[PDB]
Amino acid sequence: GPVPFSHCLPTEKLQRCEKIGEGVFGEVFQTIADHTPVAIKIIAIEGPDLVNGSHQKTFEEILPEIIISKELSLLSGEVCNRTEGFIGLNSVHCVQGSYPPLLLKAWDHYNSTKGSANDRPDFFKDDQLFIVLEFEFGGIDLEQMRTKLSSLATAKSILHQLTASLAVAEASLRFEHRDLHWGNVLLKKTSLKKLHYTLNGKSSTIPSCGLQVSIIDYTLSRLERDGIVVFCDVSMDEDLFTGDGDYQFDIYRLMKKENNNRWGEYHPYSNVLWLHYLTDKMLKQMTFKTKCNTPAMKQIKRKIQEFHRTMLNFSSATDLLCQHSLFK
Ligand SMILES: Cn1cc(-c2ccc3scc(-c4ccncc4)c3n2)cn1
Numbered sequence: 001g002p003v004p005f006s007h008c009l010p011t012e013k014l015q016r017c018e019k020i021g022e023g024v025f026g027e028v029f030q031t032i033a034d035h036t037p038v039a040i041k042i043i044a045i046e047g048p049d050l051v052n053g054s055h056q057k058t059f060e061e062i063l064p065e066i067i068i069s070k071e072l073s074l075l076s077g078e079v080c081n082r083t084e085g086f087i088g089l090n091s092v093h094c095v096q097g098s099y100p101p102l103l104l105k106a107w108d109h110y111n112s113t114k115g116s117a118n119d120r121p122d123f124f125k126d127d128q129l130f131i132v133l134e135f136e137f138g139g140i141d142l143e144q145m146r147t148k149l150s151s152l153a154t155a156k157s158i159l160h161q162l163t164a165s166l167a168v169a170e171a172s173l174r175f176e177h178r179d180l181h182w183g184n185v186l187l188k189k190t191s192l193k194k195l196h197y198t199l200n201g202k203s204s205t206i207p208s209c210g211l212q213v214s215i216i217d218y219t220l221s222r223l224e225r226d227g228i229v230v231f232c233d234v235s236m237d238e239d240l241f242t243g244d245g246d247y248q249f250d251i252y253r254l255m256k257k258e259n260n261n262r263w264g265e266y267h268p269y270s271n272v273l274w275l276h277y278l279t280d281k282m283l284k285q286m287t288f289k290t291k292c293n294t295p296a297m298k299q300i301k302r303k304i305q306e307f308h309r310t311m312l313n314f315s316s317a318t319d320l321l322c323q324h325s326l327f328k
């Protein structure tokens with residue numbers, strides 16, 4: 001059965017919560033347990049009330065994210081298809097209760113300093129069900145690092161880490177992220193000079209430039225084990241394909257065109273589209289501390305422009321990782 005908020009979030013853990021994140025889905029907090037930062041996504045489910053202007057999801061509707069989070073997390077521990085470039089899932093709880101007053105406190109501070117689009121979650125009765133997903137801390141997202149990344153060689157490590165991770169997910173799980181905007185790429189200092197993945201039994205390494213990529217947020221994602229497909233059916237949606245201002249909102253339209261609006265199908269090309277979009281963000285809307293002044297750095301910059309220019313002619317992240325000159 002469900003458990004009080006206090007089962008996931010005992011006092012000390014609940015007291016250390018700072019809000020870091022939000023969408024219509026609900027709220028994301030960061031806290032510390034056993035000296036280790038973790039991220040809490042909290043989703044109200046099954047309720048009649050609108051939240052941030054939409055109907056709560058049923059338990060059934062939230063299972064997909066839970067399953068895909070678990071499967072991508074488990075890749076860090078696999079052999080034939082091993083990657084750490086998704087986000088560790090620590091736990092999942094069903095909780096019952098009004099929102100902890102101490103999460104309201106954290107919610108308020110965020111709303112003051114940074115400002116929130118969300119309803120203050122103070123209107124939930126003591127019979128309200130939530131899902132609490134606790135994740136590894138992955139660091140800070142690509143959007144909020146526009147200005148922070150050092151060289152462009154860093155952008156290579158990132159595209160490589162991202163491509164490798166999706167390739168391993170394609171091979172293992174016939175995975176499409178389907179929503180990999182620069183909000184959904186987290187970065188994190190590492191001491192490791194080489195990072196490791198295994199693709200279909202073949203192990204290779206990627207120079208980190210001392211950053212560890214973590215792909216997050218499997219809300220629109222698709223995959224299958226033994227012919228069971230887990231996805232978000234969005235054939236009957238308008239707003240997603242109507243957006244604009246950003247190359248992002250083209251990728252939705254370009255996915256629908258590629259998959260003929262049949263979202264249960266495997267179209268690993270969707271992963272290429274997002275990697276292009278990310279590569280685009282790297283070359284246009286991203287700005288680095290050190291520009292490309294020196295010879296061998298401009299040879300990296302050409303190979304990425306060459307990547308931007310060619311990658312849309314690859315059928316999968318797997319195809320990109322294995323056949324593209326950027327990764328040779
Ligand atoms: C710093 N950090 C965030 C995470 C995380 C994991 C899964 C997920 S699923 C959605 C979000 C998210 C949404 C909005 N704004 C921030 C994060 C998310 N965040 C892990 N570490």
Ligand code: NA
Nearest residue numbers: 084085086214
């Ligand atoms: Na990771």
